[PDB]
Amino acid sequence: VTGSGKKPWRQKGTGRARSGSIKSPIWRSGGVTFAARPQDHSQKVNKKMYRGALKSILSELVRQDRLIVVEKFSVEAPKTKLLAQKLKDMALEDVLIITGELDENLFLAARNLHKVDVRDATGIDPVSLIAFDKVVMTADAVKQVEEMLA
Amino acid sequence: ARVKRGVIARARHKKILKQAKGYYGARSRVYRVAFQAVIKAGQYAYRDRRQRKRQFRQLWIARINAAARQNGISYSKFINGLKKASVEIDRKILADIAVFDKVAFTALVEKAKAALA
RNA sequence: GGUUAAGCGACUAAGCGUACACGGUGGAUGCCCUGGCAGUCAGAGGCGAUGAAGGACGUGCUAAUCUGCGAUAAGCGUCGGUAAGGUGAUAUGAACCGUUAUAACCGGCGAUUUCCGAAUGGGGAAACCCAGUGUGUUUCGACACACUAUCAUUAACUGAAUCCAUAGGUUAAUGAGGCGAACCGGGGGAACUGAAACAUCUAAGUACCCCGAGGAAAAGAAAUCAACCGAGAUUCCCCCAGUAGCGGCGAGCGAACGGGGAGCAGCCCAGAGCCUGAAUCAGUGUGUGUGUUAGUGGAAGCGUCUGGAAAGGCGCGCGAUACAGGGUGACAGCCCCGUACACAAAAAUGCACAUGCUGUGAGCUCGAUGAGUAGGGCGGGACACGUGGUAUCCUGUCUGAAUAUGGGGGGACCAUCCUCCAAGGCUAAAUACUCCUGACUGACCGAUAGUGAACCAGUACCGUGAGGGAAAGGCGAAAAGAACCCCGGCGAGGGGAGUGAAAAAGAACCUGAAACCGUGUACGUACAAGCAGUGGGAGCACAGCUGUGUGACUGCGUACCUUUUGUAUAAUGGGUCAGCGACUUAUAUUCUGUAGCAAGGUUAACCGAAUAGGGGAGCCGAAGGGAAACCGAGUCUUAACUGG
RNA sequence: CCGAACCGACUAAUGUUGAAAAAUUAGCGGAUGACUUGUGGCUGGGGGUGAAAGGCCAAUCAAACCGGGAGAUAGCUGGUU
RNA sequence: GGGCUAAACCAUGCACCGAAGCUGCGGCAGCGACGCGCGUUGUUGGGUAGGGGAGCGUUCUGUAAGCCUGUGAAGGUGUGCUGUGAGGCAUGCUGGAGGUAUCAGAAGUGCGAAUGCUGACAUAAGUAACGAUAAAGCGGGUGAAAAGCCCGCUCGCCGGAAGACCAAGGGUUCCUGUCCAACGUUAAUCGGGGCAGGGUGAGUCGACCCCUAAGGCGAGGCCGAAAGGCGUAGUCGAUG
RNA sequence: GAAGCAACAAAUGCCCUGCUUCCAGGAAAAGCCUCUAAGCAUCAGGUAACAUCAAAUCGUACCCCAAACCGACACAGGUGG
RNA sequence: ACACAGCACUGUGCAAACACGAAAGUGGACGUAUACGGUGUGACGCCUGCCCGGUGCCGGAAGGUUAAUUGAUGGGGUUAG
RNA sequence: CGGGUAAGUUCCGACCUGCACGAAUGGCGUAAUGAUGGCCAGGCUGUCUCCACCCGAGACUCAGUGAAAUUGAACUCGCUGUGAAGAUGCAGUGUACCCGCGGCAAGACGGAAAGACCCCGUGAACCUUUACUAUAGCUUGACACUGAACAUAUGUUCUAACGUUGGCCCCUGAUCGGGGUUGCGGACAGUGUCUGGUGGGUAGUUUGACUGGGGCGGUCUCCUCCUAAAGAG
RNA sequence: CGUGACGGCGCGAGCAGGUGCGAAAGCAGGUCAUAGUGAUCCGGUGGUUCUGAAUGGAAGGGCCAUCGCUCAACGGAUAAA
RNA sequence: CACGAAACUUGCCCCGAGAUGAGUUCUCCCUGACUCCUUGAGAGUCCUGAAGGAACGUUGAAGACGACGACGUUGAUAGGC
């Protein structure tokens, strides 16, 4: 806190409580007793626990019928309207789409659809697999995920 | 995550001051004083749930004594006579009868006198 | 019937209490963000004698302050952008400018740029006082402009004691000085504190003072390590390891070898010949790209309900490489500004190429190979290493080699072997930091918080001075900021009227808590003794026997915190309210719980676009005993164990 | 030497939330001197200055004030929702 | 304490009163058994330092482009209901735009005390005091209002000053008009207060200027780790 | 718009930076006057009279033993001539 | 109480002792032992006795002891043989 | 003991039994002087016996303005007892209708200032010294700057280092500085490094605990008996 | 096995080796017993089938035996008050 | 059954019925109408307004202020005369 180190008033004789610093956290405008510093909040996850959790999540998606496997999933042009129609045909609304290779037209077509995300197999994460209503994987992405998780 | 205390602090102080209604001066207006008064009132009330059972029995006994002596017998002999006659009416009821049914109370006195004779 | 007598007895409230209603004061709370806080990614890493930072005084149709500017004074020229509006804010008005392109506004380049300030013509109590010289000009009063500091270097001319000389003197050219938050190198260098005292030691080469530099600095191409195998300059990160050691062997201090990474680069003089101008850097022109400094286009919505207002509800549509974000009378993809995406430069400038011009020298050969130095004695300092058995480094003092057939090092020292070549120098990258600029982000703050400062704050105010240093945010969607009438002093203040969704939103303005102070009503209270309540309880009032308010009379009953053997204590602390105010954070270590894997478990830095994946350098565990060599399910002890 | 101005400060009362953070009132001492006063200058903190009281050095003095080391340390007291 | 000749004392006896002890009735919890979380059963439940266990609420992140909300959010203020407690729920009035279940996650997470810090407001109390005991009285004027202002007459006080004039220091306080919120220890029509306008005229007064004192700075210079110290030629410096 | 004279008394002001006396023995520099050196030579320069021009700039209000300065105050204080 | 004129002791030969100062310098002093510093005493009058063992100061310097420096002699490590 | 007083722990004069005067940290006298200390007398008085009256400024009442310290909360009596041991608040009892105003200070262990005395803390500061450890200064010697002869480490001589706060000359308009010259010193002096001594001139610190408060005294480890309550302690 | 918070201190049959006395059984690991004492660090001396910073040695260290404290404030703050 | 002291209860002086146990005595004054209601020590309107009190004024050997006393034209309360 900005200020001087001068003792506000003498130790004895004035009839006031003793003061030492204008910056005392007891005082208005004083310091914060245990002032925060920037923190690193990240945790360690064991490699085998990360992979174990992914296998648990994918297995539960299958049991709950939230994993949909298709041979192919693509659009002809980078047009949001085309992907919206495709998803409406398959009765999908809030969906994560996992492809083997990131189709450039598909990625652009999904940007402005806020309930829809498009990833490659190497970029799946545990929170996304739980957060979306459905998960659509191409047959190619399924193999890549199988190999990735052994 | 800074937490301001005002809304919760106000509710707590208001809860105590509501329990202090009717008290005199700062005791119904000033939190520091009202809190002490609410605690002391709670201590007294705990103590006086026990005292209440003592004071009422003491009152019933005094009234039975008066009614028994109107009928020519002391309280202590009356109670002993009822116990020898196997009468199990308690003092709350004996005091009620002593006030509201003087004829029935006389009958109880006669029952006690017979068991003592 | 009356009179008398005796007994009993309501209606009083000066004031006070409790409850409720309605207000005042006051500014909590909630909601709010043109202010802060912490970062990430980029940029820029300086400004100044061509006069800085920072100021003084001016400058408008202008009285003040803010912002801008400088006697050409909210501005002038020019080249570009852009345009239907404009002449900065307070802040209306006045006088005006402009609408198809010299209005304004934005950007490049120019012009102007008072005085003080390094301040530089001399002086000086900063923003003032006083000159010299030379060019001009003059109406003879005078006027304008330019020069004139110091020091360093270089050159010319001159020039003592003193003969040559040298010192000295004059002039010219070129440079320097001052300011700035951190980072960097160097010269100096505390104490509190810890050691439960204290002196060695620690704190600590820290704080602080000083000098100097750069965009980074420093360091750097082995007289280095290693261990008989090899490595191959410097710097930075993770290990090694809280190990080896140091240590009033106390408190504490604390490596290296070796390993994994980031980054990678080598050269020159101590000199001649040949061959020559050949590499390579620096400068200056010119091109081509690529940024930076203004900008251009940029999709798609209506009806109806509630309402002061629709962006909300309901219905039916449409755009999306655009559902980032902000605004609009409540919450808007389609109203507005943007956003994705696609384009743009007359001029100045950064970068990377290219190509000129200038300087620089490339190669081969043959040589050479840093002396008051290495080493030593004495005194100190630095090395994790405190003189210790103490190598090595620096040097204040006194000394002093060999010089390649030679010398340094390998932790006292010697021999052997290995390895390197001091006493000359240059060198990018990986690294450090952020006064400053742009963009973006936050389980950061939201007016006692966050900067001291959300507001004209380093201000008001305090101090001789260095220096110290506040408080203070919110009407409404829009000022529609209340015409007019009335009381009043042509007041203050108020009542009407009107505006508005709302005026107990009226500027002392959102919400409007509490302490504190009132008016009204109900009940109690003037024969009654104490923590003021609690248990019992009559009467009265009120609303529907009960609920609410009050509480005569009566049993019991000496606040709270702290500190103590023990407190009603006449021990401590608190006038009251509201707001704030105290076991945290990082790393290491051990134990418990829980999860994964299991005789195994797990990676660090780093790589990677990656919360993935790679990376097993390492760390812990599966073996102990012994001081150790060493041995090993045993081992140590002892000559040896009945043994321990 | 006596005594005003001027420079002092021996006694008493008042005052003591003062008229005043040292005064007022009545008396008191020096008053051509080691006198007094204006303006300007010089001495700086383990230092100054001192006809010496540890006096004075900006209402501060057995080591000034301001900023920093700095959140010194506190086996003590208080407080801890 | 009243009072007591027993209402004192001794002895014997039988009654009764008397505690949060024991019993009765209803309820909650800990621990252990016994059976299938439940039942049954036994037993326990005063507590400072302190250990262990289990929870409430607050702000923020996700879930949440969800859900509630102008047919009224947060906050404020009442009332009713509800749980063993921290608390929870509903709703009238006020308010006028936000709020947020659940299950998880993180903490500037809870105040009555620290002669705590900041602001607000009490008490004493309508009390002390209104700043030299030089002193006032009256008539007239102005004004909403006059003890205090203006005019007049009288009275009193200073007169080596309580008069006049400079330097220093201050900086518009000066004069005129106008106003009376705040300032003035009362009122105020008055003011050193607010606002507006006006006002400072030099060859001779002063400064600047020439000249020096104490002292300061100081080209070169001498000295010093650096910063700097001293000082020559000089150049400043009035109080002359 | 009259008178607008005299006598006497009289400073701490003036003559006096004097005079007398004493010891503690009482600034400096310029303006001013004068002397020449280098130099200049019927030139410049000097002296006098006369004429003519110039003398800039800044301060100037007001308080000043105080209600305007130093004392937080419209403060019984302090403030040199 | 301090100071004081007076008194005494003592230092000081001038580049004085002494003091401020890493130093250059400066004060002492443009003074020179009839002077300057330090210390005690305190006008004046009459005076100021005995003790040199202790502590200090002054002088002495033959002997004992003793620093840096010097490195005789002895002992050890290493190994050509 | 004498004097003074009716009465004199003071005063004055003596005595000497000086607890514990004494000769320049001066002895004994001393005219004059002193807002200096003690004692006595005349005058004088409200100092007092012993107070009375009066004049003014407050206090008191009215109008205007308008503070303060303090404060857990108060429905805030006496007495005797009790009790953290001195009670408005407890017990018993007595007395007491509600509320101002002027007065007085016995109590609220009244207000004021985290007791200054005392003790404690392995707190502080400043002062002292023959406390400890250092150190500026002063002083000693060795080596360096530092040389030549001769005689016997010492002595004599020399000049050329070095000193000069002697004269003269120049830079120069200069009591600084520098250079030149001359004289005087002269290998001395002085300075650097090393070294012995001295060193409250200055600095950093230490200076125990137990204890019927602390200090002073005593004690501090070990052995035996008793206290010790028939095991141990 | 006793006794201590601990550091420690004490009693002890018996086993191996070697010994003295006794014909022998046996007794002897000091003394009728209980006081006669001082941790650690730092070093000294002797020994040693340990270690030996490139290697052989050596220095130094370890291990075994032993020495230095009225550290008596006797669990001993420092070498030094 | 009787004497017996400044102590006790009276006698003397003053206060005194808040003596809530609020006492006594003497004297004076008031002798209307109506309505409503929840029907009783009820509320209201009209008429009435006594004895006496208070207020105001002039005042006091009464007095801080209150209080107390005298007097107010049918009058000596104060001032004047």
Ligand SMILES: [K+]
């Ligand atoms: K605070």
Ligand SMILES: [K+]
């Ligand atoms: K998307």
Ligand SMILES: [K+]
């Ligand atoms: K009442």
Ligand SMILES: [K+]
């Ligand atoms: K309030």
Ligand SMILES: [K+]
């Ligand atoms: K200048």
Ligand SMILES: [K+]
């Ligand atoms: K220290």
Ligand SMILES: [K+]
């Ligand atoms: K300590």
Ligand SMILES: [K+]
């Ligand atoms: K200490």
Ligand SMILES: [K+]
């Ligand atoms: K929008």
Ligand SMILES: [K+]
């Ligand atoms: K060494």
Ligand SMILES: [K+]
């Ligand atoms: K601040």
Ligand SMILES: [K+]
């Ligand atoms: K602030």
Ligand SMILES: [K+]
């Ligand atoms: K409102």
Ligand SMILES: [K+]
């Ligand atoms: K309000």
Ligand SMILES: [K+]
């Ligand atoms: K009661």
Ligand SMILES: [K+]
């Ligand atoms: K307390």
